[PDB]
Amino acid sequence: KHLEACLEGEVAYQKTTTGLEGFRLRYQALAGLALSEVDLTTPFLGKTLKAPFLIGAMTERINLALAEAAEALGVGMMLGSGRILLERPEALRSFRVRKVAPKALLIANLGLAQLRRYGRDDLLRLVEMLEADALAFHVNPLQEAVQRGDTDFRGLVERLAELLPLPFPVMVKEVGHGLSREAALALRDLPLAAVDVAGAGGTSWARVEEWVRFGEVRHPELCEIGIPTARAILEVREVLPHLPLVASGGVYTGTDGAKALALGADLLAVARPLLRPALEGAERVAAWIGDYLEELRTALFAIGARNPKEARGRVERV
Amino acid sequence: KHLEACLEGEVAYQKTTTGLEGFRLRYQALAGLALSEVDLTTPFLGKTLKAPFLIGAMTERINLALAEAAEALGVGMMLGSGRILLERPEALRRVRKVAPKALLIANLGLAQLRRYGRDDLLRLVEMLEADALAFHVNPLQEAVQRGDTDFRGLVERLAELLPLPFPVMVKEVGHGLSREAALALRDLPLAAVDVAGAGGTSWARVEEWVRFGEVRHPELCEIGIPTARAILEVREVLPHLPLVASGGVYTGTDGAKALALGADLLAVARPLLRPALEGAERVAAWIGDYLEELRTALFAIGARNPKEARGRVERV
Amino acid sequence: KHLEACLEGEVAYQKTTTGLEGFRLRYQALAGLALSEVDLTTPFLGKTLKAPFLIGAMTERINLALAEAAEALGVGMMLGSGRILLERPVRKVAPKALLIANLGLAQLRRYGRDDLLRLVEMLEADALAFHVNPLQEAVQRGDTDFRGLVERLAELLPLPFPVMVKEVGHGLSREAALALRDLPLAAVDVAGAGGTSWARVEEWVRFGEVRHPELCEIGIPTARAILEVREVLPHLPLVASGGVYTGTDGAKALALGADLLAVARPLLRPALEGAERVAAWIGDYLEELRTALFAIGARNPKEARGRVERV
Amino acid sequence: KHLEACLEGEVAYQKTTTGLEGFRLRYQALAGLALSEVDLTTPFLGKTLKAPFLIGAMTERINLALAEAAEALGVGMMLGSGRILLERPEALRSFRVRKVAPKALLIANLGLAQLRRYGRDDLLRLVEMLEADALAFHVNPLQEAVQRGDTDFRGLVERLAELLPLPFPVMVKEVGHGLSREAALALRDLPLAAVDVAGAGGTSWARVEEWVRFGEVRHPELCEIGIPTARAILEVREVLPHLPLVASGGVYTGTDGAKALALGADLLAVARPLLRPALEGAERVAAWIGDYLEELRTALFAIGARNPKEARGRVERV
Amino acid sequence: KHLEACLEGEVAYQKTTTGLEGFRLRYQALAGLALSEVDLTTPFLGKTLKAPFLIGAMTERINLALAEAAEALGVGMMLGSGRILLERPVRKVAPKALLIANLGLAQLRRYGRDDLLRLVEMLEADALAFHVNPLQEAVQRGDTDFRGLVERLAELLPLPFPVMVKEVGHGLSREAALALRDLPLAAVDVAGAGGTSWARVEEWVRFGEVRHPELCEIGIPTARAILEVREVLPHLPLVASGGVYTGTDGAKALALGADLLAVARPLLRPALEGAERVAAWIGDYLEELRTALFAIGARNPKEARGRVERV
């Protein structure tokens, strides 16, 4: 159903935008460097990816096409909520993807609200079964409100905070509505491995949720609520000046990814746009991502940056 | 192919603009002067042009129509990359024949200094009988085109073998020169600079259009410094070097704004491409009309010449 | 690539239409019957389908989703050109379901009597369908020779399994139907213009856009094709396909002289999402075809014949 | 719900039209008559109405506003399905409208499919309770199909045919999808008092029905099925050359009513367009209808017709 | 100026169309032939062209680009009014190519037998074409006297080289064809409405805009002109021109009764870019005309006749 909606409905934001359009990249006609010298290699969560890119979390045959491409290109990949795996270890055969992705970095996904019913061990089991290199918890009160699902988000930050110091790197992310600066403050003390701001502008899960319930978005404005990806990057970075940040949420082009990095991001993550190419097969997914990085490179090149790092600051507000 | 695209495709910028629309000219109803007294005469690169205008660089029969008009009106003209001439001296069939007096800036493009030197340059300005030489930088274009993508140490390779017999200038091809780009040139003894900013023709678009018959990465091709921003930024860094505003400065009124923001010369390329295909008379008509309005604009502004235009504009 | 284009490009016809819009169904407010009494059961190619519907030919994991649904609902299914199978040697999910193997006429120039039997064999198909498509092949720039294919079939015809001829969306004219009148075919698929234009799909694959629009709109509108072909082959069972995307349209198709409806492209996306989605699509289509036949006053696909008028 | 949909949804036909636009009225600049001499008086179902107009059937406080206006202007009125009254005689107090409409002609409404569960007496009781001057049965297989209600319309024409010869005049009508010529044939033998073709072009009850189920019309083409009001008039008249016919189904203006009459109708009936003015009160309803007849008169006047009858034939196909 | 207008103004017809859209080509999915066997070779005015195509008359450097392409592909070419040549006295690039000299009827009022021979002479043309255009001349406000021009030609006719009459885009009516039925012409160019409207081109030159739109839409649609003229001159070779801008349209043109297609304005811009560009344009046009004839079931421009129906 949710997969159906993302593929057939108007689930993207209609009024709010990532805000990246409000910034222009500083073009250096005389930055004097060679395109061949711009290196996208970037180490993330204890592994060296060939580009600062992560396939976004998506929730069976799609995962094998996504992963296969992740390996082929050398980029990371966040798995869909393995929440269903801790409930049916028999269903493990379908998230089994290491087979196609031997080396590729794989972030397992679970979602904070679950720490209210799962603990220390269960977690280890999940990262285990999947043979993941890390684990990501996603928070999403607005989505859950509109969906009318577990609507209780009390004391989840501490329940994590305590049982934290885990064997594998851990990161927190939203699902497209964004993480505010105060949200970043609430995480500043936990020893996280990284953060995914996943802001507004791309796919609105409040819309995806309503579309699943009515076959149309009945409360448009309610579903546009969120922190634009651009604002989220700036705000979160502002609070966590050193933790590696992932910009996701409508960062659908290489040029935009460059802007994302310039504003303070370290990694880019794309989800919905890969959903269709994933249905067509790994080759198609690899093609999509390949082209995205091909332009991210050219963008960094025109900016005068030799790598995702030197992009920082190379942008100005329109 | 490139000539085809500029003539048949959507090669102009779609979202980014020159930004000149963000400024209004300060109309002086009582500046108390006569239209007849506004003089466009302006000396550039060691020659006195009748108007602060340069026909933009364009790359065979078109050049003879452009030049012929350049003479007729007394404006300059930048030649297309004569890069092909240093490779096939036979095919040097030259426009001086139609343009005896007219100021002609030869064109070559920086990335070439990686394979050509001191002499070769002199030969080019020579063969053409040009009054100067212009090197153009364009990493973004070359990236999208997928051509020579190496721009390392080109500024110095020029810097050293610089002090040349003829005046030299650096220009972009429509994506613009940033203030830092102007900084990287501040030390070289250049004769002038052409900021050639975004807003007019996007060569990234022209390039993609040549490869797919359509622009596949629109946003990627809109990357650049708007002509208005480039004028302000570059002037800011090189307060005295003569500057050429080009890149979507398609009307006289816009040229006036360009000057007001800190430019000394205006340059137009693509818009002249079609009239050039129709003949010199048509090209002369176009440019004539442009200057006719530039004059009226300077007149309404209260400026007697391209110089007094400086500052006579405000941000909307 | 072709699968990519159908899923991402403007491959549907832009100017020519099926023409079904030119006809209105004769609504009988007092036909006096019960919706429950309208039966879609229809026997085709030696099997009894639960509705006069066939999943259109489409060319790997999609086929298993399409077939699984074909079984679930009791409708037929045409397989993609098994041409690739005779060069590099789904029943598992579809035990009972009627399956028409597909090959394409131009191949009889390089394959014969046996090879055919082998194909229907390997697939465990209930019949075999040859598709003709000169316009597509022209634009594609593929095998462009269609000489003597009708006879090469005509002779080696009388085959162990029922055989049918079809186009790929540009339609079969009345003269085309004449050229087939003598062959002992099991059925025909007019596959007319109005839905997906394979000339467009073909050009889109070559330029990422349709460069010769008008050239790709060439064809016989599905409505015209039904009328024309029926006119020539008054009894051979006919399949209406080519932009017959709704139940209401299917009803019109039948009313004009069709016996079966076939849908292709519209099922391509639901096929990528899985059998449940495909079954949902088709289920809904038949749900409306039934209501349409109901309002028309027809108790079955047959009584629909003639229950329509030109607007 | 149904009342909600007609008031808030796109329940009118989207592609099919009444078809009246395909005819132009024959304007007689020199028909040489006085506007004052065109008389709308027309006797229907044993009563003399002041204009060939009937308020369409609509299904509580609205009925009192509609009726009150019916009296005020001297036009008829068809009541909503009193089907609910034969099931809850206690609910009679709400259809009780004779109090406001002492004289006005009132056609009770019931709907054919009910003769499968009600008989001779029950009918008399309904016309009785309401103190109606006649009874109208409505057929609507397409609506019922889409609604998913009683979908069995077998032998309803005869069940009526036999127990017919009733104490009060009886008429058959559709609900907006129209009656075909064959439909008219199936009625040619029954001794009906009149017929309401109620064709397509105005409100599509298939759309109203789907809108109630999904909050949107999911099968547009399916809901456009029907006989355009113009076609229905011609076709039915063709079969029943003398039975008085009512043209309804998108005949929303006086000028259109004139066209309706010209094509062979005797009475015009309007429903949905009166629904909102009915919610505002009798005065508003009277205003609407008053204005409609004011233009019908002018139209008949320009046509050269002194009354609804002389309108017959005064129109041509564009 | 006129060259400027055609290149920069809205000189095409705005309301009237060629009318070719009113016909659909009869697609023969089973015409059973090979694309390779459709031959465009067609002999015209005493020469064998490789395709039934003629570059339209256009009026200096453009002509060398057009001609050079004419040779390259093997198609004909009509020269601009050489009227200016008989007042102030391209084969070099086009040695073999068929070249129709152009002059225009209204000139026979001031030029005679010899002068004509001189023109065809100087140009080394293979024939001569006179163009009539009262509507253009009216709007232009030029020589507006067209009296007795048909006879002045009629008499001094029987000329050493083949002669043909044409309009300039407003078309030749059936009666116009009647007035020519007696003269021994080599061929006719109906040059109908639907493409470039010279009344518009003319007004655009005078006001920089079309002030009397409806006045400039006056004319016989190319489709009607083909039918009407053919009707009167069942055997004289006919050229369809006037908005016949695509191969598919050319096919329709032929099907309705034309023998040759001629394109003008659409070649004007590629002509400004050079012969290669012009050749590309025409090459692509014939490439589709071939495919169209192929789908129609026609082996050559002749078998196309009648292979079309009215929509």
Ligand SMILES: Cc1cc2nc3c(=O)[nH]c(=O)nc-3n(C[C@H](O)[C@H](O)[C@H](O)COP(=O)(O)O)c2cc1C
């Ligand atoms: C089909 C689909 C499934 C998803 N499943 C998950 C999931 O299981 N867990 C999660 O944390 N996010 C999930 N997401 C969210 C993305 O990882 C993330 O919210 C992103 O911001 C939305 O993609 P973006 O805007 O490019 O489109 C899913 C998104 C899509 C489209």
Ligand SMILES: Cc1cc2nc3c(=O)[nH]c(=O)nc-3n(C[C@H](O)[C@H](O)[C@H](O)COP(=O)(O)O)c2cc1C
């Ligand atoms: C047909 C055409 C050919 C050109 N050729 C050259 C060239 O050889 N070298 C160069 O440095 N710029 C060339 N240019 C670029 C212009 O000189 C310059 O980039 C300008 O900013 C684009 O024109 P503008 O925006 O008015 O249109 C060419 C532009 C056009 C339209």
Ligand SMILES: Cc1cc2nc3c(=O)[nH]c(=O)nc-3n(C[C@H](O)[C@H](O)[C@H](O)COP(=O)(O)O)c2cc1C
């Ligand atoms: C992805 C796709 C694959 C197809 N593959 C074949 C094929 O292998 N053989 C064939 O004869 N037709 C094939 N078709 C054509 C259809 O069977 C048929 O031409 C139909 O008329 C097009 O579907 P329709 O108009 O509903 O959409 C294919 C169509 C689609 C969309």
Ligand SMILES: Cc1cc2nc3c(=O)[nH]c(=O)nc-3n(C[C@H](O)[C@H](O)[C@H](O)COP(=O)(O)O)c2cc1C
């Ligand atoms: C709120 C509403 C309630 C209705 N109730 C009935 C009803 O009970 N019985 C009936 O036979 N028709 C009913 N109708 C139908 C009308 O009498 C008739 O179908 C008409 O053709 C629709 O109105 P028209 O097209 O102007 O809008 C109802 C229509 C509306 C808008």
Ligand SMILES: Cc1cc2nc3c(=O)[nH]c(=O)nc-3n(C[C@H](O)[C@H](O)[C@H](O)COP(=O)(O)O)c2cc1C
């Ligand atoms: C630039 C241009 C110049 C032309 N010059 C002539 C001419 O000298 N004599 C003539 O008879 N027709 C001339 N024509 C007309 C064409 O030969 C003919 O009228 C044709 O129908 C218009 O081209 P078509 O509709 O494809 O565009 C000219 C057309 C154009 C566009």
